Amino acid sequence: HSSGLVPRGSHMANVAIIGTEKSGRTSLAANLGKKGTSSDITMYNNDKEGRNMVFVDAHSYPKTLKSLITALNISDIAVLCIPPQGLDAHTGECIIALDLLGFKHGIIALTRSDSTHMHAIDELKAKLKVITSGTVLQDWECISLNTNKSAKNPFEGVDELKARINEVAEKIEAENAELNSLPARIFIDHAFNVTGKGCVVLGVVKQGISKDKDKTKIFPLDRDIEIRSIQSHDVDIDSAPAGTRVGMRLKNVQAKDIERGFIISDKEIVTTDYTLECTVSKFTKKIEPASVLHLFVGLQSEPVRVEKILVDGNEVEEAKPGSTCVLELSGNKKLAYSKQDRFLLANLDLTQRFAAYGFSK
Ligand SMILES: Nc1nc2c(ncn2[C@@H]2O[C@H](COP(=O)(O)OP(=O)(O)NP(=O)(O)O)[C@@H](O)[C@H]2O)c(=O)[nH]1
Ligand SMILES: [Mg+2]
């Protein structure tokens, strides 16, 4: 039994459209759905074509990593846009990020096809087979496409992209359905006031099934709240299973006190210090005690200091690129997480900024 006249009936896909500068990212996203929520990322919604699809354009990347990381941590499918001759620093950084995230499902969009030639496209694909070997992208399809209605071959490859997205989305729906039995957690990406309709948050159900009228908590505040209503593409729904992008009216909390990265759930760890078992990128600098890094977990980010490095339980003076270690880290602000949340570490002053992934000990 469910609300309304027709069940919402799963079908959804949360897609991140990412990549380097001048890769056609915004153009692709903007042609895949209607412009919605817009901050340092922009949602393009398309619930007109079967699935409740949302495409997130990380449009403030490469300037900021948080734009990229937010897009990726609220999405289940990544579309990496690489333009002709587009094997540059930020393309490599995107590849590294996706591989550190263990990002399962994705597609490479070889954009601007009208500006290139089949033989050049085949050479770029050959090259990519190599760069992606031994990474999570190794079996991603590469689809040549453009979003130019005036090209000789207008919008070639777009239909094939959409078809592949739908194919991948189907696999994700089944994986997300397995999570329905877990306790509910919802990651918040936006919070604002709506007139005569107070505190509203936008986010995604990460696991379980969130239900209208649930009495639960918000972290890191550690405050009791009630879910007053849940909306899915603007229609009130009684429940929202894992993978569902939601709007929620909340009781007992003001939008002014909620930030992106807050979590709705019955229980979260809240700390300002972290002990992470980490694997260090091969493409970063050795990490040393007292060094400063940037930590991402869920949709939160903040500066941290490396207090201690350990290997096999013994303290060391460095963690080299491509090594495994335990890092004891300190920060200022309280962050909320559970042990299943993957952490990323970055050095914002480097060219390739991702340093490591880790999990809380
Ligand atoms: N011929 C052609 N040009 C395209 C296509 N898609 C985008 N462009 C052009 O290439 C430029 C970059 O496109 P854009 O969508 O802004 O990519 P972006 O990666 O979002 N750019 P930015 O890094 O500034 O945010 C724009 O001038 C745009 O008109 C395409 O399919 N064909
Ligand atoms: Mg962009």
Side-chain angles (χ1 to χ4, degrees), residues 142-187:
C142 301
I143 302 171
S144 180
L145 64 77
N146 73 64
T147 53
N148 186 5
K149 61 173 183 187
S150 299
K152 283 189 184 30
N153 298 128
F155 276 71
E156 69 173 0
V158 176
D159 289 343
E160 191 192 341
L161 178 68
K162 286 174 162 179
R164 182 53 182 169
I165 289 173
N166 280 104
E167 189 174 352
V168 176
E170 184 173 318
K171 294 176 196 181
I172 291 164
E173 282 153 12
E175 297 177 349
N176 281 331
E178 294 183 26
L179 300 178
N180 286 356
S181 50
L182 293 176
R185 304 178 75 214
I186 307 101
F187 284 9

Coordinates of all heavy atoms in Angstrom, one line a residue, residues 142-187:
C142 N 32.8 3.9 -23.7 CA 33.2 5.2 -24.2 C 32.2 5.5 -25.3 O 32.1 4.7 -26.3 CB 34.6 5.4 -24.6 SG 35.8 5.0 -23.3
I143 N 31.5 6.6 -25.2 CA 30.4 6.9 -26.2 C 30.8 8.3 -26.8 O 30.8 9.3 -26.1 CB 29.0 6.9 -25.6 CG1 28.7 5.5 -25.0 CG2 27.9 7.3 -26.6 CD1 27.5 5.3 -24.1
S144 N 31.0 8.3 -28.1 CA 31.2 9.5 -28.8 C 29.9 10.3 -29.1 O 29.0 9.7 -29.6 CB 31.9 9.2 -30.2 OG 32.2 10.4 -30.9
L145 N 29.9 11.5 -28.8 CA 28.6 12.3 -28.9 C 28.8 13.8 -29.0 O 29.9 14.3 -28.8 CB 27.7 11.9 -27.7 CG 28.2 12.3 -26.3 CD1 28.0 13.8 -26.1 CD2 27.5 11.5 -25.2
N146 N 27.8 14.5 -29.4 CA 27.8 15.9 -29.3 C 26.4 16.4 -29.0 O 25.4 15.6 -29.0 CB 28.3 16.5 -30.7 CG 27.3 16.4 -31.8 OD1 26.2 17.0 -31.8 ND2 27.7 15.7 -32.8
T147 N 26.3 17.7 -28.6 CA 25.0 18.3 -28.3 C 24.8 19.5 -29.2 O 24.4 20.6 -28.7 CB 24.9 18.7 -26.8 OG1 26.0 19.5 -26.4 CG2 24.7 17.4 -25.9
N148 N 25.2 19.4 -30.4 CA 25.2 20.5 -31.4 C 24.1 20.2 -32.5 O 24.3 19.3 -33.4 CB 26.6 20.7 -32.1 CG 26.6 21.8 -33.1 OD1 25.6 22.6 -33.2 ND2 27.7 22.0 -33.8
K149 N 23.0 20.9 -32.4 CA 21.9 20.6 -33.3 C 22.2 21.0 -34.8 O 21.5 20.6 -35.7 CB 20.6 21.4 -32.9 CG 20.8 22.9 -32.9 CD 19.4 23.5 -32.6 CE 19.4 25.0 -32.6 NZ 18.1 25.5 -32.1
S150 N 23.2 21.8 -35.0 CA 23.7 22.3 -36.2 C 24.9 21.5 -36.9 O 25.3 21.9 -38.0 CB 24.2 23.8 -36.1 OG 23.1 24.5 -35.6
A151 N 25.3 20.5 -36.2 CA 26.4 19.7 -36.7 C 26.0 18.8 -37.9 O 24.8 18.6 -38.0 CB 27.0 18.8 -35.6
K152 N 26.9 18.3 -38.7 CA 26.6 17.3 -39.7 C 25.8 16.1 -39.2 O 24.9 15.6 -39.8 CB 27.9 16.8 -40.4 CG 28.5 17.7 -41.4 CD 29.6 17.1 -42.2 CE 30.2 18.1 -43.1 NZ 30.2 19.4 -42.5
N153 N 26.2 15.7 -37.9 CA 25.6 14.6 -37.3 C 25.1 15.1 -35.9 O 25.7 14.9 -34.9 CB 26.6 13.5 -37.1 CG 27.1 12.9 -38.4 OD1 28.3 12.8 -38.6 ND2 26.2 12.5 -39.3
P154 N 23.9 15.8 -35.9 CA 23.5 16.5 -34.7 C 23.0 15.6 -33.6 O 22.3 14.6 -33.9 CB 22.2 17.3 -35.2 CG 21.7 16.4 -36.4 CD 23.0 15.9 -37.0
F155 N 23.6 15.8 -32.4 CA 23.2 15.0 -31.3 C 23.5 13.5 -31.5 O 23.0 12.6 -30.8 CB 21.7 15.2 -30.9 CG 21.6 16.4 -30.0 CD1 21.7 17.7 -30.5 CD2 21.3 16.2 -28.7 CE1 21.6 18.8 -29.7 CE2 21.1 17.3 -27.8 CZ 21.3 18.6 -28.4
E156 N 24.5 13.2 -32.4 CA 24.9 11.8 -32.5 C 25.4 11.3 -31.1 O 25.9 12.1 -30.3 CB 25.9 11.5 -33.6 CG 27.3 12.1 -33.3 CD 28.3 11.6 -34.3 OE1 28.1 10.9 -35.2 OE2 29.4 12.1 -34.1
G157 N 25.2 10.0 -30.8 CA 25.6 9.4 -29.5 C 24.8 9.7 -28.3 O 24.9 9.0 -27.3
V158 N 24.0 10.8 -28.3 CA 23.2 11.1 -27.2 C 22.1 10.0 -26.8 O 22.0 9.6 -25.7 CB 22.5 12.5 -27.3 CG1 21.6 12.8 -26.1 CG2 23.7 13.6 -27.3
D159 N 21.4 9.6 -27.9 CA 20.5 8.4 -27.7 C 21.2 7.2 -27.1 O 20.6 6.6 -26.2 CB 19.8 8.0 -29.0 CG 18.8 9.1 -29.5 OD1 18.4 10.0 -28.8 OD2 18.4 9.0 -30.7
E160 N 22.4 6.9 -27.6 CA 23.1 5.7 -27.0 C 23.6 6.0 -25.6 O 23.5 5.0 -24.8 CB 24.4 5.5 -27.9 CG 25.1 4.2 -27.6 CD 26.5 4.0 -28.3 OE1 26.8 4.7 -29.3 OE2 27.3 3.1 -27.8
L161 N 24.0 7.2 -25.3 CA 24.3 7.5 -23.8 C 23.1 7.3 -22.9 O 23.2 6.7 -21.8 CB 24.7 9.0 -23.7 CG 25.0 9.5 -22.3 CD1 26.3 8.8 -21.7 CD2 25.1 11.0 -22.2
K162 N 21.9 7.8 -23.4 CA 20.7 7.7 -22.6 C 20.4 6.2 -22.4 O 20.0 5.8 -21.3 CB 19.6 8.4 -23.3 CG 19.7 10.0 -23.1 CD 18.5 10.6 -24.0 CE 18.3 12.0 -23.6 NZ 17.2 12.5 -24.5
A163 N 20.5 5.4 -23.5 CA 20.2 4.0 -23.4 C 21.2 3.3 -22.4 O 20.7 2.5 -21.6 CB 20.4 3.4 -24.8
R164 N 22.4 3.7 -22.4 CA 23.4 3.0 -21.5 C 23.1 3.5 -20.1 O 23.2 2.7 -19.2 CB 24.8 3.4 -21.9 CG 25.9 2.8 -21.0 CD 25.8 1.2 -20.9 NE 26.8 0.7 -20.0 CZ 26.8 -0.6 -19.6 NH1 25.8 -1.4 -19.9 NH2 27.7 -1.0 -18.8
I165 N 22.8 4.8 -19.9 CA 22.5 5.3 -18.6 C 21.3 4.4 -18.0 O 21.3 4.0 -16.9 CB 22.1 6.7 -18.6 CG1 23.4 7.6 -18.8 CG2 21.4 7.2 -17.2 CD1 23.2 9.1 -19.0
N166 N 20.2 4.3 -18.8 CA 19.1 3.5 -18.4 C 19.4 2.0 -18.0 O 18.9 1.5 -17.1 CB 18.0 3.6 -19.4 CG 17.2 4.9 -19.3 OD1 17.3 5.8 -20.1 ND2 16.3 4.9 -18.3
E167 N 20.3 1.4 -18.8 CA 20.8 0.1 -18.6 C 21.5 0.0 -17.3 O 21.3 -1.0 -16.5 CB 21.7 -0.3 -19.7 CG 22.2 -1.7 -19.8 CD 23.0 -2.0 -21.1 OE1 23.1 -1.1 -22.0 OE2 23.6 -3.1 -21.1
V168 N 22.4 0.9 -17.0 CA 23.2 1.0 -15.7 C 22.2 1.2 -14.6 O 22.3 0.6 -13.5 CB 24.4 2.0 -15.8 CG1 25.1 2.1 -14.5 CG2 25.4 1.5 -16.9
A169 N 21.3 2.1 -14.8 CA 20.3 2.5 -13.8 C 19.5 1.3 -13.3 O 19.2 1.2 -12.1 CB 19.4 3.6 -14.3
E170 N 19.2 0.4 -14.2 CA 18.5 -0.8 -13.8 C 19.2 -1.7 -12.9 O 18.6 -2.2 -11.9 CB 18.1 -1.6 -15.1 CG 17.2 -2.8 -14.9 CD 16.7 -3.4 -16.2 OE1 16.4 -2.7 -17.1 OE2 16.7 -4.7 -16.2
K171 N 20.5 -1.9 -13.1 CA 21.4 -2.6 -12.2 C 21.5 -1.9 -10.8 O 21.4 -2.6 -9.8 CB 22.8 -2.7 -12.8 CG 22.9 -3.6 -14.0 CD 24.2 -3.7 -14.6 CE 24.2 -4.2 -16.1 NZ 25.5 -4.3 -16.7
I172 N 21.6 -0.6 -10.8 CA 21.6 0.2 -9.6 C 20.3 0.1 -8.8 O 20.4 0.0 -7.5 CB 22.0 1.7 -9.8 CG1 23.5 1.7 -10.3 CG2 21.8 2.5 -8.6 CD1 23.9 3.0 -10.9
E173 N 19.2 0.1 -9.4 CA 17.9 0.0 -8.7 C 17.9 -1.3 -7.9 O 17.5 -1.3 -6.7 CB 16.8 0.0 -9.7 CG 16.5 1.5 -10.1 CD 15.8 1.7 -11.5 OE1 15.4 0.6 -12.0 OE2 15.8 2.8 -12.0
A174 N 18.5 -2.4 -8.4 CA 18.5 -3.7 -7.7 C 19.4 -3.7 -6.6 O 19.1 -4.2 -5.5 CB 18.8 -4.8 -8.7
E175 N 20.6 -3.0 -6.8 CA 21.6 -2.9 -5.7 C 21.0 -2.0 -4.6 O 21.2 -2.3 -3.4 CB 22.9 -2.3 -6.3 CG 23.6 -3.2 -7.3 CD 24.8 -2.6 -7.9 OE1 25.1 -1.4 -7.7 OE2 25.5 -3.3 -8.6
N176 N 20.4 -0.9 -5.0 CA 19.8 0.0 -4.0 C 18.6 -0.7 -3.2 O 18.5 -0.6 -2.0 CB 19.3 1.3 -4.5 CG 20.4 2.3 -4.8 OD1 21.4 2.3 -4.1 ND2 20.2 3.2 -5.7
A177 N 17.9 -1.6 -3.9 CA 16.7 -2.3 -3.2 C 17.3 -3.2 -2.1 O 16.6 -3.4 -1.1 CB 15.9 -3.1 -4.3
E178 N 18.5 -3.7 -2.2 CA 19.1 -4.6 -1.2 C 19.3 -3.8 0.1 O 19.3 -4.3 1.2 CB 20.4 -5.1 -1.7 CG 20.2 -6.1 -2.8 CD 21.5 -6.7 -3.2 OE1 22.4 -6.8 -2.4 OE2 21.7 -7.1 -4.4
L179 N 19.5 -2.5 -0.1 CA 19.7 -1.6 1.1 C 18.5 -1.2 1.8 O 18.6 -0.7 2.9 CB 20.4 -0.3 0.6 CG 21.8 -0.5 -0.1 CD1 22.4 0.8 -0.6 CD2 22.8 -1.2 0.8
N180 N 17.3 -1.5 1.3 CA 16.0 -1.1 1.8 C 15.8 -1.6 3.3 O 15.1 -1.0 4.1 CB 14.9 -1.5 1.0 CG 14.7 -0.7 -0.3 OD1 15.5 0.3 -0.5 ND2 13.8 -1.1 -1.1
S181 N 16.5 -2.8 3.6 CA 16.3 -3.4 4.9 C 17.1 -2.8 6.0 O 16.9 -3.2 7.1 CB 16.6 -4.9 4.7 OG 17.8 -5.2 4.1
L182 N 18.0 -1.9 5.7 CA 18.9 -1.2 6.6 C 18.2 -0.1 7.3 O 17.2 0.4 6.8 CB 20.1 -0.7 5.9 CG 21.1 -1.7 5.3 CD1 22.2 -1.0 4.5 CD2 21.6 -2.7 6.4
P183 N 18.7 0.3 8.5 CA 18.1 1.6 9.0 C 18.3 2.7 8.0 O 19.4 2.9 7.3 CB 18.9 1.8 10.3 CG 19.4 0.4 10.7 CD 19.8 -0.2 9.3
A184 N 17.3 3.6 8.0 CA 17.3 4.8 7.1 C 18.4 5.8 7.4 O 18.6 6.2 8.5 CB 16.0 5.5 7.1
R185 N 19.1 6.3 6.3 CA 20.0 7.4 6.4 C 19.8 8.3 5.2 O 19.6 7.8 4.1 CB 21.5 7.0 6.4 CG 21.9 6.0 7.4 CD 23.4 5.7 7.2 NE 24.3 6.8 7.7 CZ 25.5 7.0 7.1 NH1 25.9 6.4 6.0 NH2 26.3 8.0 7.6
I186 N 19.7 9.6 5.4 CA 19.5 10.6 4.3 C 20.6 11.6 4.4 O 20.8 12.2 5.5 CB 18.1 11.2 4.4 CG1 17.0 10.2 4.5 CG2 17.8 12.1 3.1 CD1 16.4 10.0 5.9
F187 N 21.3 11.8 3.3 CA 22.3 12.9 3.2 C 21.7 14.1 2.7 O 21.0 14.1 1.7 CB 23.5 12.5 2.3 CG 24.4 11.5 2.9 CD1 24.2 10.9 4.1 CD2 25.6 11.1 2.2 CE1 25.1 9.9 4.7 CE2 26.5 10.2 2.7 CZ 26.2 9.6 4.0

